[PDB]
Structure formats: C-alpha cells, structure tokens
C-alpha cells in the first residue's frame, strides 16, 4: 500500500497506525491539499469510528471541521477535514487520532501542522456625527493602544 502512494503516509507514535502527511503550514478553514487518511495496520473492522483532534500549548482543543471518519479496509478517509482554530505564532498542532475500537486506541502525530489566518503566503458638551463616526471608526486603534 505504501508503493501505491509513495511518501504520502507517515508513522504515528503508535505502531499499529499510519496517517497522511500534512502540510507544515496551512491556512485556517482552507481545504487540505491531500485528503487526510488514517491507516490501521492491525485488524480494524469496517465501520469503526475514527476521530482526530488538534491542539497544543495555546489551544488545548482547536476547532476542526469533519474530524470524524469511518474506518473501511484498514483506512479511514476523511472528507475535507479543516482546521478552523489557530495554532499560535510560530507554533504547531499535535493531532490526536483516536480509533474507537474496544477498547479504544490512541495514536499521536506530534508537531504536525501550523494553522494561521493567511497560511503559507507569497513574500510581500456634545459632538457631531463626523466626530462620533470618527471615534467609532478608530475604536480598535485607541481601544487596543490605551489597553
């Protein structure tokens, strides 16, 4: 199976599981460049639930989209999994895959992906309305500065 997709699978801290390689850096809420897959080396009956969670120092449990998939033929194919939550400047998320067998199994993929709002990017007394709209249009400016 590794021959059909060379360099597209990677080892988890668990010897019974493999998961697709993720991009080092990726934009938040953007679709992934490679369908994310979790491969079970041992025998996992088709239909077992497999969930992934992302997190780290900043975000204990980052918000994800489509982080649940059904295991079929030792392979859980995630349908458009996306990272909504952010990992923090110069930081990465550690995925925590979890195959719900009986008992359940846990596999980790450390320092996997960094999620940011742009992702990998190309190198670069009474006052009037006018007065009120102005204060208003700045809010974020002064509000942040002064605080």
């Amino acid at each position: 199976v590794l021959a059909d997709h060379p360099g597209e699978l990677v080892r988890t801290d668990s010897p019974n599981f493999l998961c697709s390689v993720l991009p080092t850096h990726w934009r938040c809420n953007k679709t992934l460049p490679i369908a994310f897959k979790v491969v079970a080396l041992g025998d996992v009956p088709d239909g077992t639930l497999v969930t992934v969670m992302a997190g780290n120092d900043e975000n204990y449990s980052a918000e994800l989209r489509n982080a649940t998939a059904a295991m079929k033929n030792q392979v859980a194919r995630f349908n458009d999994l996306r990272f909504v939550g952010r990992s923090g400047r110069g930081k990465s998320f550690t995925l925590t895959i979890t195959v719900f067998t009986n008992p359940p199994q846990v596999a980790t993929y450390h320092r996997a992906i960094k999620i940011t709002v742009d992702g990998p990017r190309e190198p670069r007394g009474s006052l009037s309305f006018s007065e009120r709209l102005s204060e208003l249009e700045q809010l974020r400016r002064t509000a942040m500065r002064v605080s």
Partner: protein, 101 residues
C-alpha cells in the same frame, strides 16, 4: 485617510446631504437604497485606492455583513439594504432625529 470599514463609509455618504443623489435613507428605520450603485462603488474604490472597484464587488462586501449582523438586505427591493446593528446605541440618534439633520 486612516482605517475605514465599508459599512462606516456608507454611513458617511448617508450623513452627507450632498450625496442623497445616489444613496439615501428610505424613511423606514435604518433601511437605505443605493439609487446609483456604480457611483457609490466609484467613491468607495477611491476611498480604498481601488480603481477597479465596482458594485459587483462592493455588494460582496455587503454580503459578508449578513452573517456578522451589521447589515441585512431587503427582500425584493433592488439596491435596498438596512443597518441591523444598534446604530442608536452607537451614535445616539433615533432614526427620525438623525433623518431630520
């Protein structure tokens, strides 16, 4: 001229008796119409130093406010939208008081 958000810019043109030609309140709450889209589009592109700016793109920005609950569109009335945020609490003028000025 500093940071400015579309919904705020529009709010300017709506507080400038001079613009009433292409954009004006409709008398109903904070609802308003862009009697002349292409114009507003033109000024906005200017205020943002965006020559290509037009209404097709400007209406996109307006749509991004639907979610954020800042501006909603009025069903059936072309170029008709409405401020849905609490402008009264933000500025102090009830629709009429403001409409007056």
């Amino acid at each position: 001229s500093g940071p400015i958000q579309l919904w705020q810019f529009l709010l300017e043109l709506l507080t400038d008796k001079s613009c009433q030609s292409f954009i004006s309140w409709t008398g109903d709450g904070w609802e308003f119409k862009l009697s002349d889209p292409d114009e507003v589009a033109r000024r906005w592109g200017k205020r943002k130093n965006k020559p290509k700016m037009n209404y097709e793109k400007l209406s996109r920005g307006l749509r991004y406010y639907y979610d954020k609950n800042i501006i909603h569109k009025t069903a059936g009335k072309r170029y008709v939208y409405r401020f849905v945020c609490d402008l009264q609490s933000l500025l102090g003028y009830t629709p009429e008081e403001l409409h007056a000025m």
